[PDB]
Structure formats: structure tokens, C-alpha cells
């Protein structure tokens, strides 16, 4: 498949061809609003491996965030606030420069009957998935939360506040031990 | 002034050879949805031994699958694909595989002959007319590869 | 030499099974009387 070629080409990020593409695309986006609807992703391989599919129900948005609450987290929060009726699934980096960093976020509309009847995507329609970025359930949010296995995440394996509450509580049984 | 891997586009097949290639490709237009549906309904009604069909290959993933197998004889590439990275490597892949390739201006024009609004690439594997295809391939080579 | 693998499937040298499935589905629909053959549609065009 061609997607392997796309991934390999994207591996050499500092190639003169990708440099030209990035500097052209950033200049083109500089003339557009901060957040706007994207007709199609500029990195089809990344979106496809992130779960995006070219079918009625998916939406691609490009958002610009000031350089220097991670930048990806801020972008996800902004797109979720603007796209209140859509659910943020994942996002990927698409460009950067000395002033701004650009990320592309793919959204799925749970109201569209195509998604509702999609056995592989109807899970997002559950109300528990509302505003995934708000609770940091996205890929970037989970990574920032330190959720992982091993000694490197013992203090933040699942919930930094939960462990503090557990170690601060006084468990007393009916018959004292 | 851009990297050599870029600007390989903007040099394209001339008007006459491009028109000849389009005329040749129009012969193998794939059966559109309506035509295929009506033919299948007719076959079902008749039922209620077959020759292999011939059509052009246009899917980028499908074409790339056919490319690098050396089955593709001639491939058309659109020069206005917004994700240019999808087609920057295709000419080099064709050159490495020894498959003649032709850059034709307009993805919409490329797709108009395959019943699709747009089509990034188009390739031919089987033929009905082999002499015409060989002559077109030779003309395209002499006019594009030996010049640019 | 070509780089790929997975030698040619039989379906490439055999008529498509999807076509047969569609033809049989249309035959079932005709049997159920919910599809009119195009020849009968020509008569009904009156």
C-alpha cells in the first residue's frame, strides 16, 4: 500500500521537500481563521491509523494555538467548545514555526445516523463520552495524566488524586484488627 | 525555485498526446453504477462462459498495489493533488519499476473519465488494441522522459 | 523483480463471487415479487 510510503516520507521531517510543504501550508493557513472546517486531512496515513474514516459523520478541523495545559490539549478543548455537537476522538500535529504550532483534530458526529448505525463507531454516541478532551480522556490527555503501567507511573497509574484520598482515609471495620 | 523533487510537475504531456491518451482511456471506461445495476438485473431476470471485463484502474491504493508488481503498463498522475506527498514519490516509484508514467494536468479531468468527481491517478493493466497502447507509450516516453 | 508476495488468488482467474451473490439476491427479490424485470418495466412504461 501507498500509506507505508507516506509514513516513510513523513519520517524524514527535516527533508527539504517537507520543509517546503510545511512553509507553504503554514503561510496558506495564516490567511484563514484560527479555527475552520477542513475539507480533508493533510496527513491521510496519520488520520487513518488514528481511526479516521472517509464517511459521512467525520469532520476535520484545523486550529491554531499560540506557542509557549499542553498545546494539543488547548487545541482539543477549543475545538470541543466550538464543536459542541461533535465528539473529539484524536488529533495529530501538522505544522509548526517560530510563532505558532498547528494541529489537526478529527471529530465524529454522533447525531448522524451513519455513526449511530456503525457498530465500530457507535460507541462514541454513549453520553459517557461527552467532551472527552474536557476530562482528558483523549490520547494527549491520557498521556499528560501519566496513565501507564510500570514503576514509572506508580504514583500516577490511575488517578493522582485518588491515591492521596486512599492513603489519607482511615478504614475501620466492625471488629478492629 | 524549489527542491528538484518538487517542480517535476508543471512539465506535462503536450496537448496532442494528452488528447490521444484521453481518447484511448475513454474506451475502457468502467461500468458506471447505473449500467452495472441494469446489467446485473438483466442477468438475474434471464437466470430467473463469461469473458474477463476490461476497465481502467484509478484507485490510488489499488494502483500502487498494481504498481511495484510490474503489471501496470501506463499510469496517469494528476499534478494538482492537494496532499502533494501522495504523488511526489509515485513518479520515482514508476521510474524504479520501469513503468512509463505521464503527468496530466487536472485531477478533475482525470476523474471525469472514470465516473468519479476527482481521481488522483489512473493506470492500465489489461488491453483489448495492444499496438495502439504500445505506440502511445512510446510517444509519451519520447515526449516526456527524454525531454524532462 | 516485483517486491510483493501472496501469489495470485483464484478469484482473479475466476468470475467474481460478488457478482454471483448480487445476481442471486436479485433472483430472490424477483421470486418475492418486489423487483420487476426491465423487460416488464418496458411494458409497464405505457
Amino acid at each position: 500500500g501507498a500509506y507505508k510510503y507516506l509514513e516513510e516520507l513523513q519520517r524524514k521531517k527535516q527533508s527539504d521537500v517537507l520543509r517546503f510543504l510545511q512553509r507553504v501550508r503554514v503561510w496558506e493557513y495564516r490567511q484563514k481563521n484560527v479555527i475552520h472546517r477542513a475539507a480533508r486531512p493533510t496527513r491521510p496515513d496519520k488520520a487513518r491509523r488514528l481511526g479516521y474514516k472517509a464517511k459521512q459523520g467525520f469532520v476535520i478541523y484545523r486550529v491554531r494555538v499560540r506557542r509557549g495545559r499542553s498545546l494539543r490539549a488547548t487545541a482539543e478543548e477549543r475545538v470541543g467548545r466550538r464543536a459542541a455537537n461533535l465528539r473529539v476522538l484524536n488529533s495529530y500535529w501538522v505544522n509548526q514555526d517560530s510563532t505558532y504550532k498547528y494541529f489537526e483534530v478529527i471529530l465524529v458526529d454522533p447525531q448522524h445516523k451513519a455513526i449511530r448505525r456503525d457498530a465500530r463507531y457507535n460507541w462514541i454516541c454513549d453520553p459517557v463520552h461527552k467532551h472527552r478532551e474536557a476530562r482528558g480522556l483523549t490520547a494527549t490527555g491520557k498521556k499528560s495524566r501519566g496513565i501507564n503501567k510500570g514503576h514509572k507511573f506508580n504514583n500516577t497509574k490511575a488517578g493522582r488524586r485518588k491515591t492521596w484520598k486512599r492513603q489519607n482515609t482511615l478504614s475501620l471495620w466492625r471488629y478492629r484488627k | 525555485k524549489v527542491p528538484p523533487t518538487i517542480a517535476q510537475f508543471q512539465y506535462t504531456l503536450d496537448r496532442n498526446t494528452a488528447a490521444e491518451t484521453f481518447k484511448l482511456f475513454n474506451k475502457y471506461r468502467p461500468e458506471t453504477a447505473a449500467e452495472k445495476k441494469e446489467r446485473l438485473t438483466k442477468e438475474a431476470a434471464a437466470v430467473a462462459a463469461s469473458p474477463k471485463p476490461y476497465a481502467v484502474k484509478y484507485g490510488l491504493n489499488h494502483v500502487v498495489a498494481l504498481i511495484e508488481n510490474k503489471k501496470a503498463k501506463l499510469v496517469l498522475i494528476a499534478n494538482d493533488v492537494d496532499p502533494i506527498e501522495l504523488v511526489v514519490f509515485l513518479p520515482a516509484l514508476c521510474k524504479k519499476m520501469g513503468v512509463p508514467y505521464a503527468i496530466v494536468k487536472g485531477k478533475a479531468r482525470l476523474g471525469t473519465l472514470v465516473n468519479q468527481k476527482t481521481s488522483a491517478v489512473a493506470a492500465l493493466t489489461e488491453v483489448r488494441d495492444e499496438a495502439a497502447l504500445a505506440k502511445l507509450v512510446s510517444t509519451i516516453d519520447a515526449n516526456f522522459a527524454d525531454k524532462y | 523483480m516485483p517486491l510483493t508476495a501472496v501469489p495470485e488468488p483464484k478469484r482473479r482467474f475466476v468470475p467474481s463471487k460478488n457478482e454471483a451473490k448480487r445476481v442471486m439476491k436479485i433472483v430472490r427479490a424477483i421470486r418475492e415479487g418486489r423487483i420487476i424485470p426491465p423487460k416488464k418495466l418496458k411494458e409497464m412504461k405505457e
Binding site: - | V88, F89 | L3
Partner: peptide, 24 residues
């Protein structure tokens, strides 16, 4: 995989050398 190596070599030739690689 031979195909993966071929694709990597093709990408290497297409992308040229990076600005830091060009120093070599």
C-alpha cells in the same frame, strides 16, 4: 522485509539529506 527496505531506500533517495545530515 525486502519490500520495507526497498521503500526505505526509495524514501531516502527522494528526501535527500537533512540540513544536519548535509554537514557530513
Amino acid at each position: 522485509s525486502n519490500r520495507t527496505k526497498f521503500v526505505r531506500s526509495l524514501v531516502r533517495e527522494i528526501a535527500g539529506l537533512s540540513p544536519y545530515e548535509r554537514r557530513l
